[PDB]
């Protein structure tokens, strides 16, 4: 039947920031009804406001192809063998933008890659107990031949290899944990269940 | 092939907590290598440290159905209709704790299960651009007819009902975006792609 309270139901009393930098931290002071029929008192988060992103899964349907995008994450590194990931074409969302449009601004910068045909795949809270983050995940047509080299904004910092593998290398890659962040596990594991759809569609 | 430099490749020259309360917020300065060669300059980077959890998908291969929590997140207001979520079992990870304890912990604390066998689905991280969150995603052995209730620990205003589904519905509820947090859409995706030997696995 689903969920059982709507947006009637809780009151955001304030909002008040924590950290002011390149990204927020805002502690959100709420109350809300508890499942027992009461209201709860004045309960406070700390959530980390980053803004949202638009995430693009590059997939050939003719030649059954992925690219992927590796960069160092920094964050990564506490916890991984190495704090360069695989991941997918992605970038956040300003004011006023499309996630489409980001997508397709993204894939020229980071793996200079035109996009034909796109289908959404899904849009995720990437982490809500602790930060306010969606990612919007498109499935983008393209032409694996095309995607090589070393791409990203120099002016940035921001420094990004290509790398194309077949479809079903990249998802061995997800299963034996070479791939690993949320929104590449979650095309990847998309793209399993939808290819045969999709490649029928799009050819 | 596969990725190509190492922790040898990126010197972390100082980290600096800009921010420390429930959670915090630091400051990674590094340099690293780059692709066409050299190191780069001096990059600053704004990292949410938060720690890292476990998630336990509960799923029964008897009945061919998932345990699912519901409860309020309050990030997901603005960019949800409802901020009440429909999510695994799942909790923070402290010092000397594996996987696998925090999982069965939480499966009792959040939806009153006592879990059977065990098997690890993925380990990811959330969004490793901004925040340094690890999760590590088991599958559990449960018995669905057993899952009822209100539970979730009120002295930490942490609110919880549970919910049974089939498999189907709740894979149904990905595809339409009424499940739509990363660990319960990896997590049942998952369960989508190897549901059949599972069943097998457990109910011999
Ligand atoms: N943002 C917060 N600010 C302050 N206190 C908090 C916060 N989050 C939790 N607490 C406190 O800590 C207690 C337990 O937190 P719980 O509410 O069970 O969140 P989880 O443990 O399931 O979050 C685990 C994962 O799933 C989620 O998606 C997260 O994003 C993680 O990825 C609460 O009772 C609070 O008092
Ligand atoms: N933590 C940071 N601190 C400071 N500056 C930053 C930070 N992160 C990025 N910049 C600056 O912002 C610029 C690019 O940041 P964006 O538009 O977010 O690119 P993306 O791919 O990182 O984020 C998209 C998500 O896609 C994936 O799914 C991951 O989850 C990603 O987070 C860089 O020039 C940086 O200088
Ligand atoms: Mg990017
Ligand atoms: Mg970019
Ligand atoms: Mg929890
Ligand atoms: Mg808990």
Redesign the interface.
């Known amino acids: 039947?689903?969920?059982?309270?709507?947006?009637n139901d809780?009151e955001?009393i304030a909002r008040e920031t924590?950290?002011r930098?390149?990204?927020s931290?805002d502690l959100?002071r709420?109350r809300?009804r508890?499942?027992?029929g009461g209201m709860?008192?004045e309960?406070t988060?700390?959530?980390?406001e980053?803004g949202?992103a638009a995430v693009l899964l590059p997939f050939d349907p003719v030649r059954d192809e992925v690219v992927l995008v590796?960069q160092?994450?920094?964050?990564?590194?506490?916890?991984?063998?190495?704090?360069?990931?695989?991941e997918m074409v992605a970038g956040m969302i300003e004011a006023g933008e499309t996630v489409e449009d980001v997508a397709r601004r993204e894939a020229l910068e980071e793996a200079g890659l035109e996009v034909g045909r796109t289908k959404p795949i899904?849009?995720?809270?990437?982490?809500?107990?602790?930060?306010?983050?969606?990612?919007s995940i498109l499935v983008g047509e393209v032409d694996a031949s095309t995607a090589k080299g070393?791409h990203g904004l120099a002016e940035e910092?921001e420094?990004?290899?290509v790398?194309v593998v077949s479809r079903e290398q990249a998802y061995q890659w997800?299963e034996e944990?070479?791939i690993?962040?949320?929104?590449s596990?979650?095309a990847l594991?998309?793209l399993?269940?939808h290819y045969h759809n999709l490649r029928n569609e799009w050819t």
Do not use: C, M
């Not at 899904?122 to 990612?135: C, F, H, K, V, W």
């Open positions: 039947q689903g969920i059982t309270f709507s947006k809780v955001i924590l950290y930098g390149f990204f931290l959100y709420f809300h508890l499942f027992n709860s008192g309960i988060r700390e959530i980390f980053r949202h590796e160092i994450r920094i964050a990564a590194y506490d916890t991984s063998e190495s704090p360069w990931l695989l899904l849009s995720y809270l990437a982490s809500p107990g602790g930060t306010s983050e969606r990612l070393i910092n420094d990004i290899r790398h997800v944990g070479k690993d962040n949320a929104a596990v979650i594991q998309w399993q269940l």
